[PDB]
A and B are shown apart, each in its own frame.
Chain A
Amino acid sequence: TCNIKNGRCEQFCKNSADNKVVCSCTEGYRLAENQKSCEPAVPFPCGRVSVSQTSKLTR
């Protein structure tokens, strides 16, 4: 049920198999091991800030 909290899909949710669901991700990402999250599948996937680590933290 994509109805509530997007079926717990980090990005896209689609109903599948009797009240179930299947999460997917946009180009450059891949459906993580847990079937809900999206993880980068390329060095520079769309939409993400990767400069980070400013210059004063733990890292």
Chain B
Amino acid sequence: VVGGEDAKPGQFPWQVVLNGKVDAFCGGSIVNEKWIVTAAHCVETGVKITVVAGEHNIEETEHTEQKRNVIRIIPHHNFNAAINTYNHDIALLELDEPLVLNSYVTPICIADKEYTNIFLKFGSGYVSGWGRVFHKGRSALVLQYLRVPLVDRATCLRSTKFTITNNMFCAGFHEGGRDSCQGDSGGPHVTEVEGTSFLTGIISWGEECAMKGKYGIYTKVSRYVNWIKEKTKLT
């Protein structure tokens, strides 16, 4: 996250970090004790993945961390139906052993399609992660967060040569300087509704980071809430 600030421990208890062949390479959000939602581009058959919930500072021990192995990965069935479009950039990870919920390990709420879109249209949401804090610079050691405004679709379209589908939305600042960035993919874009946060997007792609006239592109979660609910049922 470029231009954001340090989160306090436990401020985004649904945030997880993913580790693999590359450490801290993407984020994710807790759906429930056994499932994480992330971006499909983070988990294209590459490695075995580990999930760390209750994480705050990647180089230190807080004694709140819960590490889990991912035993099953479900990228959205239409991801990669078309090459390099990043459309349907969303995936679910099933953990080997259930997370133990507490103040540092808490799921994010997920409303139905109608309300997820209503919340997104509130126009202001929070993004978080341990991704780059500068375009092409270092990654963060302490979880970063940033509030980003929703951007109108026509402006969104005009900002890039690449296609912005109905399964995506743009958020960011007209003047730039603040944005999600490499390593933040999969983390949540969340909207707080009277003290209760709901998942409204997945950090997905962009062109460089935080550049004036460019915006962060996000997976529109309202289009996938039915799928998340179907695949993550606990038995």
- The chain A residues found within 8 Å of chain B, CB to CB, are 10-12, 26-29, 38, 43-51
Question: Nearest-CB distance from B122 to chain A (Å)?
Answer: 11
The answer to whether residues A47 and B107 also contact, given A11-B193, A12-B115, A38-B196 and a CB cut-off of 8 A, is yes
**Would you call A47 and B101 a contact (CB within 8 A)?**
no
Encoded as 1 (CB less than 8 Å from any A CB) or 0, chain B from 103 to 140 comes to 11111111110010000000000000000000000000
**Is B111 in contact with A44, judged by CB distance below 8 angstroms?**
no
What distance in Å separates the Cβ of A36 from its nearest Cβ neighbour in chain B? 11
A22 to B171, CA, bound (A): 33
Across-interface contacts of B14 in A (CB, < 8 A) = 46-47
Q: Which residues does chain B contribute within 8 Å of A11, judged by CB atoms? A: 111, 115, 193, 196
Residues of B within 8 A of A38 (CB): 196
List chain A residues, Cβ under 8 A from B196.
Answer: 11, 26, 29, 38, 45-48
Extra pairs beyond A28-B107, A47-B196, A51-B13 (8, CB < 8 Å) = A11-B193, A12-B115, A26-B110, A38-B196, A48-B196, A49-B10, A49-B11, A51-B10
Interface centre among B102, B103, B108, B198 (most CB of A within 10 A): B103
Q: How many residues of B contact A (CB 8 A)?
A: 26
Cβ A51 vs Cβ B11 within 8 A = yes
| Residues of chain B at the chain A interface (Cβ within 8 Å) | 8-11, 13-14, 101-112, 115, 192-198
Residue of A nearest to B13 (CB): A49
Chain B residues with CB under 8 Å of A45's CB are 106, 196
Q: Is the interface of B mostly helix, strand, loop or mixed?
A: loop
Pick from A26, A27, A51: contact of B8, CB under 8 Å: A51
> Smallest distance from the beta carbon of B107 to chain A beta carbons, Å?
4
Residue ID in chain A nearest B229 by CB atoms: A27
Q: Shortest beta-carbon distance, B99 to chain A, in Å?
A: 10
A46→B104 CA distance, assembly (Å): 12
In the assembled complex, the Cα of A29 lies from the Cα of B196 at a distance in Å of 10
* Cβ–Cβ contact A47 & B102, under 8 A: no
* In contact, A48 and B197 (Cβ under 8 angstroms): yes
Q: Are B109 and A47 in contact (CB under 8 A)?
A: yes
3 smallest CB-CB distances across A and B, nearest first, come from: A51-B10, A47-B109, A47-B197
A residues less than 8 Å from B11 (CB atoms)? 49, 51
A50 lies within 8 A of B106 (CB): yes
A51 touches B108 (CB 8 A): no
> 8 A-B contacts, Cβ less than 8 Å apart?
A11-B115, A28-B109, A44-B101, A46-B107, A46-B110, A47-B14, A47-B192, A51-B103
- Residues of chain B with a CB closer than 8 A to A44's CB: 101-103, 105-106
